[PDB]
Design a binder for this molecule. Sequence first.
Ligand SMILES: Nc1ncnc2c1ncn2[C@@H]1O[C@H](COP(=O)(O)OP(=O)(O)NP(=O)(O)O)[C@@H](O)[C@H]1O
Ligand SMILES: [Mg+2]
Length: 341
Amino acid sequence: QNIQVYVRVRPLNSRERCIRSAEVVDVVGPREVVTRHTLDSKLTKKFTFDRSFGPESKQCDVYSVVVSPLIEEVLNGYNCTVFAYGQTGTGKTHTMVGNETAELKSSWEDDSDIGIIPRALSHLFDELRMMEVEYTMRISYLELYNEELCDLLSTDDTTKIRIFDDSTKKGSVIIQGLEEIPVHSKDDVYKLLEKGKERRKTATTLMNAQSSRSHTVFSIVVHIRENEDMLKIGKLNLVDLAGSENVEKGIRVRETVNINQSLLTLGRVITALVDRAPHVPYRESKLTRLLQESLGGRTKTSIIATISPGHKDIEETLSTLEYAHRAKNIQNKPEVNQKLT
Ligand SMILES: Nc1ncnc2c1ncn2[C@@H]1O[C@H](COP(=O)(O)OP(=O)(O)NP(=O)(O)O)[C@@H](O)[C@H]1O
Ligand SMILES: [Mg+2]
């Protein structure tokens, strides 16, 4: 019932290659990540995860290991969350979304540059197509930008988005005004993902040309009635966080301050949970209010921690690895949502 934690090391980029950055992070075997001393190549640190993915890792294998097992749990009425977490430019958006649009034809298994969200949509429709059930699927796509909530599937600025600390699940949130769009095909959800992707707050940064300036949550909710009639509600929350940055006026700096503060709060929440501190500071950030159910709550949660292999980034990389390594100890209490019926 623990959170599952994974690490994904991106390749050195062209600009790192040209200045010959020291590569001090290595994936060893299927689970370990090590750091190596510049001067003698001796191991300095060794962390073990549910799986570690090196710089040659493929999109289809990250999906297969991390996300494909959760599709079965969503279809069984579990709430499931995957979130990518790590320094700016380390591969969160590559991993969670990617850049290619999915062919209405492709499989989740296909070896391509497509990331998790399109593979998960494709896989869920492939499963639902074979099930002897009635189902509804509703999509929402939420952005948290400079501590304000934005609906990426709205076509105007006409509807206010508010967050309420939750109902009988007394550990959860309700988001009023967010679109929950019914979808009936892969084509329908691909067309929504593409429209919402275009609305995301991003910045053209060197080696990070679509830097995420916001946290985004893509949520899939499935109601499944078999054929007492049994109704199950499954949820899959696919979360792309904005990246931390080791810290001149302007919106850019205000974004960096808000991103770094929300991630510091997420670290405090992880530390409080693993230390067993009596107060877990979920309410200190909108991000941790959104993630509260996923962190010690009634969800199956998987974390993908993304890191750079370069010595220039080793302090940010060690922070990510240390927070990821501690989050493996978080105990969740997943429960089937079965509203009888
Ligand atoms: N595994 C990978 N293989 C090849 N290119 C990669 C990989 N991971 C990331 N990149 C590239 O590195 C750049 C930054 O990746 P991206 O996934 O957008 O970073 P990010 O962690 O989302 N950044 P940020 O949103 O600012 O925190 C992009 O041009 C990606 O194509
Ligand atoms: Mg990003």
